[PDB]
Amino acid sequence: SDSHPLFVRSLAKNMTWQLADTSTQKVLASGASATSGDKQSLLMQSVNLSYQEDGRGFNWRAQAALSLSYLEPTPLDSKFSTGYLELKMRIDKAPEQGANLQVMCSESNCLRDIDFSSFSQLMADKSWHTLAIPLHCQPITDALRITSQNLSLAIADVALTIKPSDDSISLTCAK
């Protein structure tokens, strides 16, 4: 009742993964694995967290954006106006030249824009962590977008929530 799943073991109905490299082909992926348009810049595989294939691993080898995206622009439910995007993430290879985590993006337009440097130390054990991202410090297209040139991580259990799980780490707003 607290939450709206976006990717909890499988994509919620109106959702896709989007793998967007520097090529002229953008890939909308709804299964266990995918490649970006150039077949190399951004790859998705399944990984196992709590069940077989409940996570997705993503490997960046060149400039590319991964999004978890709505099939059509969807206004943020007012239920979540002071809520959180929650997800589990494991960063197995930190980005040498950095990465951007954007949350709840419209056409022009993200609710949060977080550099990986801002939470890199808490992720540096290369273990899974539950991250709670407060949405506030118009129709939404990308629930999340991660952009980098070189990076390896995995994501699971992505949901909008009004209250962060107990063992969550809040990516609070920069001062």
- Chain residues in the site for Cl ion (CB under 5 A): 95-98, 115-117, 148-150
Nearer to Cl ion, 16 or 149 (CB): 149
Residue 37 vs 98, nearer CB to Cl ion? 98
Question: Long-range pairs for 168-172 at CB < 8 Å and ≥24 separation?
Answer: 168/86, 168/130, 168/131, 168/132, 169/119, 169/122, 169/129, 169/130, 169/131, 169/132, 170/84, 170/131, 170/132, 170/133, 170/134, 171/112, 171/114, 171/118, 171/119, 171/131, 171/132, 171/133, 171/134, 172/134
Residue sitting closest to Cl ion (CB): 98
By beta-carbon proximity to Cl ion, the closer residue of 115 and 125 is 115
Question: What minimum distance in Å lies between the beta carbon of 90 and Cl ion?
Answer: 17
- Least Å from the CB of residue 146 to Cl ion: 11
Q: Decide: 20 and 36 in contact? Cβ < 8 Å.
A: yes
Q: Which of 59/148 has CB closer to Cl ion?
A: 148
Could you tell me the smallest distance in angstroms from the CB atom of residue 148 to Cl ion?
5
Least CB distance from residue 94 to Cl ion, whole Å? 9
d(CA 160, CA 6): 7
